[PDB]
């Protein structure tokens with residue numbers, strides 16, 4: 047703000063409150079912890095190590111002289127509840143949570159996709175620490191071998207902008223991505239590698255026990271069975287996912 | 291390629307040595323092209339201009355090109371200057387085509403760049419450090435020397451090369467007296483510097499669990515197994531019919 | 534150019550278009566000069582004619 | 583809080599008759615007075631003054 051008639055700096059800073067990325071921060075704070083989702087029990091512990099634990103006690107990492115993890119990269123079957131696992135940690139840590147659908151990026155206006163992801167990353171540093179959930183990496187992961195003449199360079203530009211923000215030259219900002227894909231065959235060698243995504247995690251299909259876990263949560267929202275036997279239920283749902 | 295021009299200019303004088311006008315780095319990712327650029331930035335202390343190749347080309351026509359000129363005219367005032375261009379993958383199109391927005395307008399910002407680094411309008415003293423993943427999606431003008439006179443290949447670090455990377459990360463950590471880095475670099479053959487950071491952090495996760503400050507030999511081999519397993523699978527299959 | 538205080542033409546101006554770095558930039562000075570006709574020599578002969 | 587306003591603009595051209603046209607960032611082109619702080623000898627058309 048400038049006091050007019052001399053038009054010189056008098057007041058820092060009213061800047062800027064930009065709804066375009068400001069408005070995609072917190073999701074009214076998650077009501078999901080990792081006690082309102084299961085089935086991916088084994089995976090959950092791994093994730094708590096990579097994200098929550100630095101925040102819980104930093105000193106355990108300082109103590110072993112190690113860099114703390116950069117978060118987790120999840121692939122698996124669609125719908126297993128990768129979103130809900132990001133939500134579970136974000137809530138529990140009591141840190142800033144930025145949920146972006148990451149496929150809604152990539153504009154057909156050139157490099158606008160890249161611009162936008164530059165803002166979301168910057169936004170993260172200002173409100174650091176912040177955990178960012180980048181959903182869907184099937185429309186922002188580029189292909190280096192041509193298949194769409196106008197397409198390849200465009201998705202690539204966007205992609206290498208966010209990589210640049212991630213640890214290209216610039217600090218992490220204690221992000222801690224937390225970003226879900228389902229294909230590891232559509233990623234580029236550039237992002238695939240760790241130091242951008244330290245612990246690459248396989249998310250498989252739920253075990254026998256895991257069907258059962260998910261089931262008990264959902265039937266407690268219902269009126270529940272009066273002839274309980276969850277062993278039967280598990281068998282049928284074998285070969286499916288958490289969303290099913 | 292940049293130390294000697296600033297600190298040893300009498301050499302240039304006496305012998306008669308034309309100055310170098312850039313360094314091109316290419317090679318697989320995570321190897322520490324970015325670490326080398328910072329190090330040079332820190333340790334020759336002269337004007338370190340950091341720009342990014344995805345940052346060029348915006349939504350208006352010819353904005354990206356505008357932006358390139360601004361950078362070159364400011365570099366010319368600030369010389370000695372090193373422009374450090376991070377990413378060359380999306381900014382360059384080896385192939386040419388017409389009337390495509392990812393393959394004609396990315397070429398009208400390429401053409402402004404080729405073209406101020408050296409060209410009719412000089413330079414300054416840049417010394418432009420370019421770095422990319424692949425040259426196979428990089429325009430040949432950059433590839434050819436004349437400007438970007440030292441064509442620096444970068445491979446995945448050597449057998450001995452990988453033992454040194456381990457030892458930098460360990461220099462910051464701790465170790466046990468059963469630890470042998472050579473055995474671990476073997477396993478991790480054909481791996482970049484970034485991968486090694488993940489081994490040392492992951493090994494650190496085992497040490498933590500077991501409540502110890504030092505990392506032992508067992509923890510590292512456990513981390514090579516851990517990280518790798520979760521990235522590609524092992525089960526399947528035996529016959530039936532393949533027996 | 535008009536008088537600022539109240540308007541009236543006070544100066545013709547020898548009349549311009551906005552030369553900036555256009556016609557203003559005349560450079561052909563060393564290293565590259567006419568003492569350095571490196572080539573590709575036949576190509577330069579065509580240009581000279 | 584009162585630091586005076588000094589307009590910033592870029593030179594359109596340098597006049598032979600010992601004056602200079604300079605474009606304000608407001609917009610309107612102006613013919614300015616030379617001075618001995620910054621001469622027409624450190625300046626060229628496009629110089630930020």
Ligand SMILES: Nc1ncnc2c1ncn2[C@@H]1O[C@H](COP(=O)(O)OP(=O)(O)OP(=O)(O)O)[C@@H](O)[C@H]1O
Pocket residue numbers: 213214215236240241242317318319320321322323324325377421422423455458482483484486487
């Ligand atoms: N040789 C190395 N030794 C130790 N750590 C390394 C090494 N190389 C990279 N890293 C770590 O991985 C991080 C990310 O990689 P960095 O940004 O340096 O890669 P780059 O080679 O410039 O890659 P790209 O092809 O993606 O442009 C580094 O900042 C560093 O912490």
Ligand SMILES: Nc1ncnc2c1ncn2[C@@H]1O[C@H](COP(=O)(O)OP(=O)(O)O)[C@@H](O)[C@H]1O
Pocket residue numbers: 082083084085124125126127128129130181226260288289290
């Ligand atoms: N493990 C789970 N527990 C509870 N609800 C689940 C689970 N997995 C997915 N769902 C539900 O299925 C739907 C789609 O899955 P969602 O969590 O959005 O995942 P993704 O981002 O992995 O596609 C949502 O309505 C979600 O509540």
Ligand SMILES: [Mg+2]
Pocket residue numbers: 129181
């Ligand atoms: Mg979802």
Ligand SMILES: [Mg+2]
Pocket residue numbers: 320323324376377421422
């Ligand atoms: Mg790099």
